[PDB]
Amino acid sequence: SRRRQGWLKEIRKLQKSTHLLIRKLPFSRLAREICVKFTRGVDFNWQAQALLALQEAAEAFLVHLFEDAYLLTLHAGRVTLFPKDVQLARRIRGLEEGL
Amino acid sequence: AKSRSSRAGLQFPVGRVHRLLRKGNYAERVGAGAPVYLAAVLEYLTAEILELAGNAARDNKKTRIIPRHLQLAIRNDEELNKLLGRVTIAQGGVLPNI
Amino acid sequence: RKESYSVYVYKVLKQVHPDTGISSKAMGIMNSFVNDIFERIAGEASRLAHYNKRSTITSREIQTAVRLLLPGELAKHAVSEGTKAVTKYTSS
Amino acid sequence: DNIQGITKPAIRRLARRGGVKRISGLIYEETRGVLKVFLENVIRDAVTYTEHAKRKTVTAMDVVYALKRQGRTLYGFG
């Protein structure tokens, strides 16, 4: 074949590493854009640690959300994660845990 | 012969809110405008809830507000519903869904 | 002896709906609601003052705590009401 | 295009760490929207804390406090 289990190697490797998976500069650009969208006046500065903590929290949130949504995927007898799975996982988690 | 509530234009007891702030050991010291601001906010939220509850009692063709009407008022406003997201209204029932 | 907010809830009810009564159990729910929101705001202001190494809860902490706890437009109107009240109160 | 900064392979790596085998194509737009919603909530509270202090820089502690009040305690930056 082309690749027996290429995804399985990727999963097994990612689930034992701890580094961030989004790139620092794109993430910080996005975060600063949102921050200025909130502040009508002069933008705030950002500690490097502030942006780092924000990215850590965001990535942990997204990973846990993907884990929860894949359970709904398998629940429907599928293996492909659909957007409706993510939406339902958000809806069941509630207003707080699911935004 | 003028209450602090009257001076602020409120119906909620500024003196009582001040006493509660002081005795709840929230901080070692309480400003003068803090109970005024807090009572104003509490009164505004009470008004916002009671208005929608009265509207629910009206279009429900009743005359007295019951817990059912408070529940209907809260779960039908998105902001109030987000605020009271983890709150259970006793004898409130649910909202009709499918 | 026992404090409550039943008389004030009734006053504001007369203001907003001058012809609608309230049930005894609904009044208990409104008391619970007032106590709950008071506790939330007061605790948030407390920990704000503690974060900023302050020792007094001023009307500025109450404003920030209101901004943190309420959703968007609710918080906007609540801040407006509170500032209006403290202005009218100091202007005496 | 700051929201487009989150790339398809990055979202894929997130889903793989989450344990997903196969990923639809619309998952990428969905995830960008979800991440933007999450960031708006935390950044709003963080800048609220930063404004209450008379500061102009956002601090790791401001982010930590925002997360704790939203119910997501974070431990590495206290």
């Binding site: 957007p83 939406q87 339902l88 958000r90 809806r91 207003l95 699911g98 935004l99 | 008004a47 916002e48 208005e51 929608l52 509207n55 779960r75 039908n76 406003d77 998105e78 902001e79 109030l80 519903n81 | 907003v16 437009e73 609710l74 109107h77 | 737009e29 969905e30 960008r32 929207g33 979800v34 919603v37």
Partner: peptide, 22 residues
């Protein structure tokens, strides 16, 4: 549908907040 309160606070009904909107 959406109902303005006895203030300029327009009080919308809750919707599918769980769906990502453009």
């Amino acid at each position: 549908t959406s109902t303005v309160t006895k203030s300029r606070r327009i009080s919308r009904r809750p919707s599918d907040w769980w769906v990502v909107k453009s």
